[PDB]
């Protein structure tokens, strides 16, 4: 009957066979599988969020955003599997392409030459420009959210924490968070993803998290320990979790020249690094300026860097209402459904 995996149900229909456990992901575990229609081995993640308002929302986003987005650098949802009627749909399977590794695993045991870091950075920014032009924030860019196969192709994924941007809360892992957010505050500006990306670069250069820290004050001081104590217009700036009184009551910290920290890092990468990892969000480099930086000049081509066909535009409804929208949304992948 329905194929089991690690004693767990994984009924994905006769379109996918040969299931192989790979690990965890979120509302459920993740498996590999052979697609009997495309003759490839897609990745399928089981999600069971119908009885959670948080999960339900994080799901709907991930499904709605990806389904509407189409970019070489933004992972795509190849298919979705759920019961014929919302009455039985107790879990959803989102089938996507199977990339070999990801930036987290790679950067951990693997070493990347400068040429690879430059290409990786570019693919990352090229994709970020699309999302950012879509009037959207990823809000969670990190090594483990950048997939890749041996060809060096990179794709951004997981938009369950994304958010719609525009001019005018429980956090796991903080290593890639800008100072303004620090310790539950959720970002609202594209400039936040830049800091994250900046942080991701730093890691590809040393294979080690640029801003570790027992807690947010320890991380905070780790930053200044590198970037040196910021100005007063920089502190008084978007830094106000109140506990900022901490930084205010803190001696002078000097900056560590990037070149010293990264003795084997190219001069161009560092200059751009610096531009991204700036305390004052307002001064952080934007995605378009970055794509045009001397470092990424061998790949730079604004005509090959498409924007969202249309920006992205009500989402705190009760779970059973989200399930409803999660049903309607997944209705296109059902047989003969136009």
């Amino acid at each position: 009957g329905p194929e089991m995996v690690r004693g767990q149900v994984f009924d994905v229909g006769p379109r996918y066979t040969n299931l192989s456990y790979i690990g965890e992901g979120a509302y459920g575990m993740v498996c590999s599988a052979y697609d009997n229609l495309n003759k490839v081995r897609v990745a399928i993640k089981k999600i069971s969020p119908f009885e959670h308002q948080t999960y339900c929302q994080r799901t709907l986003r991930e499904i709605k955003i990806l389904l509407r987005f189409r970019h070489e650098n933004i992972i795509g949802i190849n298919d979705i599997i759920r019961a014929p009627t919302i009455e039985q749909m107790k879990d959803v399977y989102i089938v996507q392409d199977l990339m070999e590794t990801d930036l987290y695993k790679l950067l951990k045991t693997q070493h990347l030459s400068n040429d690879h870091i430059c290409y990786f950075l570019y693919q990352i920014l090229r994709g970020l420009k699309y999302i950012h032009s879509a009037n959207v924030l990823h809000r969670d860019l990190k090594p483990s959210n950048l997939l890749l196969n041996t060809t060096c192709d990179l794709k951004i994924c997981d938009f369950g924490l994304a958010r719609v941007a525009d001019p005018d809360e429980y956090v796991a892992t903080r290593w890639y968070r800008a100072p303004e957010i620090m310790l539950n505050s959720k970002g609202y500006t594209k400039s936040i993803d830049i800091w994250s990306v900046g942080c991701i670069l730093a890691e590809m250069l040393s294979n080690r998290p640029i801003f570790p820290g027992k807690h947010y004050l320890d991380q905070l001081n780790h930053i200044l320990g590198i970037l040196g104590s910021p100005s007063q217009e920089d502190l008084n700036c978007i830094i106000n979790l109140k506990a900022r009184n901490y930084l205010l009551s803190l001696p002078h910290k000097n900056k560590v020249p990037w070149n010293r920290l990264f003795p084997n890092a190219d001069s161009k990468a560092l200059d751009l690094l610096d531009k991204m990892l700036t305390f004052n969000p307002h001064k952080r480099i934007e995605v378009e300026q970055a794509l045009a930086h001397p470092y990424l000049e061998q790949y730079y081509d604004p005509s090959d860097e498409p924007i969202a066909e249309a920006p992205f535009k009500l989402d705190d409804l009760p779970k059973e209402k989200l399930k409803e929208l999660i049903f309607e949304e997944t209705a296109r992948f059902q047989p003969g459904y136009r």
Partner: peptide, 11 residues
Amino acid sequence: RRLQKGNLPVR
């Protein structure tokens, strides 16, 4: 041009 310039066998 096109998606090129890269190679790295991994997990």
